[model samples]
Target: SMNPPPPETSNPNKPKRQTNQLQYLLRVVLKTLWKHQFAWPFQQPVDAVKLNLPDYYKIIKTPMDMGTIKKRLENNYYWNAQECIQDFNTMFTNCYIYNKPGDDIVLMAEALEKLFLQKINELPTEE
Candidate 1:
């Protein structure tokens, strides 16, 4: 008979508080990124019809934006910080894939990525 041990109780109160605190810290980073001038480029999802890029949807299969990320964060919709961070990466990588090296959007993407990571780097350091 394989008798498995009872699951570890873990800290009853602290995990939720820690996760909530992580979301709070994530929001702080989001606010900082939102205020940056170049942030506007990635602030919202691309409107392919309006921008007249017929192939946008074809090439960029998955799209993520600061606007969507903020709304999700506002509702505390994420299960973990990894998911939130991945969204940011997706947002920037989408730009990288869609725009060429000489494009201004590329510059914005790079800037935002750098700024985002700078803030993210500090989040874990405090604990």
Candidate 2:
């Protein structure tokens, strides 16, 4: 057959969703915050354990660079780094909170689409 295969079936009662690496990373970080058992907290909870704030910040900084992000954003016609980061953060939060992989990937893809669309929409034709 030249057609694509059917989608995988999950539990009807379960809230199924796509997810990606970014979401997984956010989940791990959040989980670390939520679970006091870890040297640091890794979950959703205001009072979640706050072990090494500096170390935590370091971990956060390793992957996310605001300046570089900002530059990339400004280079784009419409989307600034802030928009990209915000969308990414939202996607990450959703995946972590729901523990859903499919949905997370969907969200990331959506964010990327929006970013590109924004740039396109802002373009001015000389015709």
Candidate 3:
């Protein structure tokens, strides 16, 4: 049986505790990537879609699927951030490799990669 709620009220101003560090890091990376999505080659909308690059266009157009990420973390119980970082790397890498995006895009990818590395480094090493 599920436990009953406590009668005592909680303070609203107090920050809610994060149950998963990976989730928080993923959110930060996603937001940073989204903010820089429009840089350089992406700025040229005509050429982007005209080239028929669905992978590149999809990420630039749509917002990050936070719901899907949340569901994957909660339902599947996968904690490794490597896969998430790889997926993000692929998105930017595609722009550079296939589409030949400018230096600005490459720099953006580097910044995102750095954040991913920093967060992953913060994770406690297994005993």
Candidate 3 residue 57 Cα shift, in angstroms, is: 9.3
lDDT, residue 61, candidate 2? 24
Worst 10 residues of 3 by lDDT: 1-10
**TM-scores for all predictions:** 0.79, 0.20, 0.41
**Regions more than 4 Å wrong, model 2:** 1-102
* Over 4 Å off, model 3: 1-21, 31-79, 99-102, 124-127
- Over the stretch 1-127, how does candidate 2's per-residue lDDT look in tens digits? 1212221222345443323322322334223322333212112211113432233332232222222223323333122333344543543353344435566434543444354344444433332
* Whole-model alpha-carbon lDDT for candidate 2: 0.33
Candidate 1 residues 60-83, lDDT tens each? 777888887776676556657777
- The local distance difference test score of model 3 is 0.45
Q: Mind giving the per-residue lDDT tens digits that candidate 3 earns over 1-127?
A: 2222321123445333333555654465444444554433322222434555446444443222333334444443343555445444544555556444557656665665676566566654433
| Candidate number with the higher lDDT (1 or 2) | 1
